[PDB]
């Protein structure tokens, strides 16, 4: 395609590929919430135990 | 700016004067940008020539 | 020499050979020649089934 068609089919992949791109990464954050409680956790009983 | 570009074409050519157009016109004789900002004017004017 | 009537058009299949579109493209007969999912200049630098 030339650039008046192949901008239309690039923005449609742009469109998915972002979301998907922002999906994974709140996922991540989420996910190192619950590894930072169970690290403070673990230095918690370091210190205790 | 305002520029007032002028020529003589045949009716079948008038699609042509637009953007995002091919054709012998829009390709080797006046083309216009996609991101074209304007009006195009046209007439027939075959009782005058 | 003849074409075909609409209501029974003909079908040519084209294989084992080299594709030059410039000739159709810059030849200055046709009134109408639109491409979809293609560009009509980009052609030769495709390969098809």
Do not use: H
């Given at each position: 395609?030339?650039?008046?068609?192949?901008?239309?089919?690039?923005?449609?992949?742009?469109?998915?590929?972002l979301q998907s791109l922002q999906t994974y990464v709140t996922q991540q954050l989420?996910?190192?919430?619950?590894?930072?409680?169970?690290?403070?956790?673990?230095?918690?009983?370091?210190?205790?135990? | 700016?305002?520029?007032?570009?002028?020529?003589?074409?045949?009716?079948?050519?008038?699609?042509?004067?637009?953007?995002?157009?091919?054709?012998?016109?829009?390709?080797?004789?006046?083309?216009?940008?996609?991101?074209?900002?304007?009006?195009?004017?046209?007439?027939?004017?075959?009782?005058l020539d | 020499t003849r074409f075909a009537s609409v209501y029974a058009w003909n079908?040519?299949?084209?294989?084992?050979?080299?594709?030059?579109?410039?000739?159709?493209?810059?030849?200055?007969?046709?009134?109408?020649?639109?491409?979809?999912?293609?560009?009509?200049?980009?052609?030769?630098?495709?390969?098809?089934?």
């Amino acid at each position: 395609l030339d650039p008046p068609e192949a901008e239309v089919q690039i923005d449609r992949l742009i469109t998915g590929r972002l979301q998907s791109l922002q999906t994974y990464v709140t996922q991540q954050l989420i996910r190192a919430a619950e590894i930072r409680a169970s690290a403070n956790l673990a230095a918690t009983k370091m210190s205790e135990c | 700016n305002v520029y007032a570009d002028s020529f003589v074409i045949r009716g079948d050519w008038v699609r042509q004067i637009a953007p995002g157009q091919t054709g012998k016109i829009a390709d080797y004789n006046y083309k216009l940008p996609d991101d074209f900002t304007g009006c195009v004017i046209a007439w027939n004017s075959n009782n005058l020539d | 020499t003849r074409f075909a009537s609409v209501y029974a058009w003909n079908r040519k299949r084209i294989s084992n050979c080299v594709a030059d579109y410039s000739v159709l493209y810059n030849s200055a007969s046709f009134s109408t020649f639109k491409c979809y999912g293609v560009s009509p200049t980009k052609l030769n630098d495709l390969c098809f089934t």
